[PDB]
Amino acid sequence: GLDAVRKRPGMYIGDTDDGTGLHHMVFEVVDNSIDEALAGYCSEISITIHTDESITVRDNGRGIPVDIHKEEGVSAAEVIMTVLHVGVSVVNALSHELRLTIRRHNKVWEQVYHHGVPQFPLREVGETDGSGTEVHFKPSPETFSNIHFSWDILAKRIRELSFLNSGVGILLRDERTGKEELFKYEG
Ligand SMILES: CCNc1cc(F)cc2c1[nH]c1ncc(-c3cnc(OCC(C)(C)C(=O)O)nc3)c(-n3ccc(C(F)(F)F)n3)c12
């Protein structure tokens, strides 16, 4: 259960005061998009740093499957966001607010969590021509002490992701400063 994760966070995410754990949250999310790239269905990832020190990750993969998962009773998406046994549930648990948006089967689905707790089941909220998964999460002040993300640190590790996963283009955007960079390795 997520209760333990919130109770002793450094054990799961990394040090919660020096920025290590805080930045791991971003790459905990991003790695799922990378897995989808390794499978061959994701070519584009974008990471946005918001003025309120929240983070948005978005990929262009197949979208998380949304049909009802019967060992739980809830959408598989909700399962993946709320149960593990690091995963993306760790990020969810340690987030004040987190919005999940899935584009799949030409439909748009979303769900909102508060500290890893679903506010409504995955619901359909529109039509789309795109596909992929988007995640917007705000690190909990109850967990991390100095919430400020570093362009430099995110930039560095993204450059390496880009370098190691040829053919994936990764867009980094900081709305605090308006810096913007697309890392794609085609040299
Ligand atoms: C921006 C954050 N992105 C993101 C987070 C996350 F956290 C999971 C996913 C994600 N983007 C994804 N994009 C695709 C899948 C995905 C979709 N379908 C399958 O199907 C599996 C089969 C057998 C059909 C195949 O591989 O061909 N697998 C993964 C996915 N998901 C990652 C885990 C899942 C899960 F378990 F829910 F199925 N979806 C995620």
Between CA 78 and CA 73 the distance in angstroms is 10
Domain around 25 = 1-187
Burial 77-101 (b: 16+ CB within 10 A, else e): bbbbbbbbeebbbbbbbbbbebbbb
Atom of ligand 1 nearest to the CA of 76: 37
- Residue of 28, 64, 89, 122 to test ligand 1 pocket, by largest number of atoms within 8 Å of CB: 64
163 CA distance to ligand 1 centroid (A)? 23
Asked whether 133 and 63 are in contact (CB, 8 A), the reply is yes
Domains held by the chain: number: 1
Place of tokens 């707790």: 117
What is the SS3 assignment for the chain? CHHHHHHCCHHHHCCCCCCHHHHHHHHHHHHHHHHHHHHCCCCEEEEEECCCCCEEEEECCCCCCCCEECCCCEEHHHHHHHCCCCCHHHHHHCEEEEEEEEEECCEEEEEEEECCEECCCCEEEEECCCCEEEEEEEECCCCCCCCCCCHHHHHHHHHHHHHHCCCCEEEEEECCCCEEEEECCCC
Ligand 1 centroid to residue 98 C-alpha, Å: 18
On the CB side of 70, CA atoms within 13 Å amount to: 0
CA angle 51, 91, 169 (to 5 degrees): 65
Pocket, ligand 1, Cβ cutoff 6 A = 29, 32-33, 36, 39, 57-59, 61-65, 76, 80, 88, 133-135
Quick check: 98 and 91 in contact, CB under 8 A? Answer: yes
Q: How many Å from the N-terminal Cα to the C-terminal Cα in the chain?
A: 45
| Pick from 162, 22, 28: nearest CA to 89 | 28
Pairing of strands 179-183, 169-174: antiparallel
Tokens of residue 148, six digits: 């400020």
Q: Which amino acid is at 39?
A: A
Whether 113 and 140 have beta carbons less than 8 Å apart is answered as no
Residue burial 9-45, b: 16+ Cβ < 10 Å; e: rest: beebbbebeebebbbbbbbbbbebbbebbeeeebebb
What is the bridge-based pairing of β-strands 68-69 and 74-75?
antiparallel
Q: Among 36, 38, 48, 89, say which to mutate for ligand 1: greatest number of ligand atoms within 8 Å of CB.
A: 36
